């Protein structure tokens, strides 16, 4: 047992990470087959980062303006293209370490692992969720642009996030791997504000189930609730409404624990109206919402 | 910015993970050069797991009793040896993916990344600390025996933990890679109890500094404290006494933030005596003690 913020093993992504430089601007790229993917922002200079026109910027570049570094080996760029907010640099060598992969866009509330890199060098791995305002509460410093988020399904890396920038509040914004931003943000060095966030209710319930699986039961109660009355209470606390699809998704955990979803919702209602009274759940003093039902099942069942 | 539970990239360890079977007992091993390291408990049968004599058990085995599986390739065992609680299986192939590595034993309060594996297959990576009672609060299911904990220094993997077992309270016990247990535990399927734990004070202070670096300042105050008066208050709350060496270690964070260590100790004293009054620090409602000063510097500075 035990319950931890768990990321996917990162090796398959580490073997894809490279450094991309254009002019004096540098960041991280993702080398898959004979293409390197990176934020198009790399073709900006300090003069252009505020209000760039990327079509003009790219038309003014050629292959030789792009330096791609894989370890100590320079990959020669033999083509360049823009796809929305990502640059695609065709190189003359296919990555021998290319894993089986796919580009998948994720939904608010789902989770993924982030491999933070600097200068093409992986430095750390952590787990995060896509918030309902399409930001992620990541951990990123200057130089982390182009770091990727991903999930692993069996042997297949599903890339879902490429990091672009930090917002004023310190949360992070990026795109899927087709270069389409998550949320209403643009790759311009302008002060952009994240919208309002909500608590991912289904995830909180999944985490309460994880706690029960690990012997934390003090928050349980004899009461049950209707879905509608739960939602009436939960909206007041900035929680996402719970739907029947969410109940269905929680079916497996409900079965493994013998606690019906609406019964656990009654526990959640009480915790929202009363607080925790100085107690904890799975070592936390607040309700955790960055674990999906799938993450819980993976960690607690296998 | 941002502050997350961050593990080291795991690829270098993933390429070392193998499956070891003896009889019907199976678990994970660590293949480095031409040696596979695993818990000696693998030579136990269900009859022997309660009160084994491992010297007898190993004398009754030969190389052909050990099946080592690296992916789909079977490695032939050509020698076998015991070193304390780890078995060393000499195989006829050196691991081509062997990273530069070392075996280092860690101290209570220090942190490391865990690569949870099952049947030799890496499944997840998370970060944990060695508690003062020499347990770790890990996340492990049946089949995780032999999973390793490690740190990375530049290009060198410092292995520091091999997982053996789960204690009744759900916390975990294991050895260093020379087979020497952390804490007063033995590799016998007997009900063993973890001793009392304490909060890792220096780590809490390091995390308060991380919070200040990320703009969480509400807990700061004008007061300073002496080291002795802080310790008098902190012992009452089950915190480790703070030493001058701990102050020294916190020097860099103190400098980067301009807040003297004893000033932050005054904040910590107040949080201990008053609680958080419904506020949070770096997204947590309780004081976090699994980040060392080094982890904070690595994440917040680079
Ligand atoms: C020589 N040199 C200077 C460079 C500056 C760069 N800008 C950034 N670097 C970053 O690390 N963070 C960043 C910082 C912290 C966490 N997370 C990301 C940026 O936000 N920006 C700003 C930013 C990035 C975008 F991709 C975008 F569309 C709009 C922006 F305002 C980069 Cl990308 C390369 C540099 N090379
Ligand atoms: C066919 N088959 C059955 C096996 C049973 C095995 N026993 C365990 N497996 C484990 O996964 N956990 C475990 C479980 C959860 C978290 N963390 C570790 C054990 O604690 N034990 C118990 C245990 C392990 C030790 F290494 C030890 F010294 C003393 C113990 F009581 C293993 Cl090792 C292989 C098996 N093969």
UniProtKB/Swiss-Prot annotation, chains A, B:
Lineage top rank: taxon: Viruses
Q: What does the UniProt record report as the effect of altering residue 145 to A in this chain?
A: Complete loss of 3C-like proteinase nsp5 cleavage
Consequence of changing residue 205 to V: In strain: Zeta/P.2
Instruction: Enumerate the Cytoplasmic topological stretches.
Output: 1-302
Activity control, as annotated, is:
Inhibited by pyridone-containing alpha-ketoamides compounds 13a and 13b. In turn, alpha-ketoamide 13b (tert-butyl (1-((S)-1-(((S)-4-(benzylamino)-3,4-dioxo-1-((S)-2-oxopyrrolidin-3-yl)butan-2-yl)amino)-3-cyclopropyl-1-oxopropan-2-yl)-2-oxo-1,2-dihydropyridin-3-yl)carbamate) inhibits SARS-CoV-2 replication in human lung cells. Inhibited ex vivo by michael acceptor inhibitor N3. Inhibited ex vivo by compound 11a and 11b.
Which cellular compartments is it found in? Host cytoplasm; Host Golgi apparatus; Host nucleus
Reactions it catalyzes: TSAVLQ-|-SGFRK-NH2 and SGVTFQ-|-GKFKK the two peptides corresponding to the two self-cleavage sites of the SARS 3C-like proteinase are the two most reactive peptide substrates. The enzyme exhibits a strong preference for substrates containing Gln at P1 position and Leu at P2 position
Instruction: Quote the annotated effect of residue 142 to A.
Output: Does not affect ability to cleave and inactivate human TRMT1
Q: The cross-link Glycyl lysine isopeptide (Lys-Gly) (interchain with G-Cter in ubiquitin): at which residues?
A: 5, 90
Q: Where is the Peptidase C30 domain?
A: 1-302
| Active-site annotation | 41 (for 3cl-pro activity), 145 (nucleophile)
What the protein does comes down to: Cleaves the C-terminus of replicase polyprotein at 11 sites. Recognizes substrates containing the core sequence [ILMVF]-Q-|-[SGACN]. Cleaves and inactivates human TRMT1, preventing tRNA guanine(26)-dimethylation of tRNAs. May cleave human NLRP1 in lung epithelial cells, thereby activating the NLRP1 inflammasome pathway. May cleave human GSDMD, triggering alternative GSDME-mediated epithelial cell death upon activation of the NLRP1 inflammasome, which may enhance the release interleukins 1B, 6, 16 and 18. Also able to bind an ADP-ribose-1''-phosphate (ADRP).
**Partners and quaternary state?**
3CL-PRO exists as monomer and homodimer. Only the homodimer shows catalytic activity. Interacts with host FBXO22; this interaction promotes the proteasomal degradation of nsp5.
Q: What is this protein called?
A: 3C-like proteinase nsp5
């Amino acid at each position: 047992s035990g319950f931890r913020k768990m990321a996917f093993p990162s090796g398959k992504v580490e073997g894809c990470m490279v450094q991309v430089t254009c002019g004096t601007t540098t960041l991280n790229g993702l080398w898959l087959d004979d293409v390197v993917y990176c934020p198009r922002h790399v073709i900006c200079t300090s003069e252009d980062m505020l209000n760039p026109n990327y079509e003009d910027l790219l038309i003014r570049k050629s292959n030789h303006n792009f330096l791609v570094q894989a370890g100590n080996v320079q990959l020669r760029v033999i083509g360049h293209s823009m796809q929305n907010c990502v640059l695609k640099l065709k190189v003359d060598t296919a990555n021998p370490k290319t894993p089986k992969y796919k580009f998948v866009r994720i939904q608010p509330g789902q989770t993924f692992s982030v491999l933070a890199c600097y200068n093409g060098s992986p430095s750390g791995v952590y787990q995060c969720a896509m918030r309902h305002n399409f930001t992620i509460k990541g951990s990123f410093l200057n130089g982390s642009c182009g770091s990727v988020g991903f999930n692993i399904d069996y042997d297949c890396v599903s890339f879902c996030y490429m990091h672009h920038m930090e917002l004023p509040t310190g949360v992070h914004a990026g795109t899927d791997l087709e270069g389409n931003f998550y949320g209403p943000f643009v790759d311009r060095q302008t002060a952009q504000a994240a919208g309002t966030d909500t608590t991912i209710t289904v995830n909180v319930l999944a985490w309460l189930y994880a706690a029960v699986i690990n012997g934390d039961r003090w928050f349980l109660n004899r009461f049950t609730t209707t879905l509608n009355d739960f939602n009436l209470v939960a909206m007041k606390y900035n929680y996402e409404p719970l739907t029947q699809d969410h109940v269905d998704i929680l079916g497996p955990l409900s079965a493994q624990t013998g606690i019906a979803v609406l019964d656990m919702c009654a526990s959640l209602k009480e915790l929202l109206q009363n607080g925790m009274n100085g107690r904890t759940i799975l070592g936390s003093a607040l309700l955790e919402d960055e674990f999906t039902p799938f993450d819980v099942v993976r960690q607690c069942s296998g």
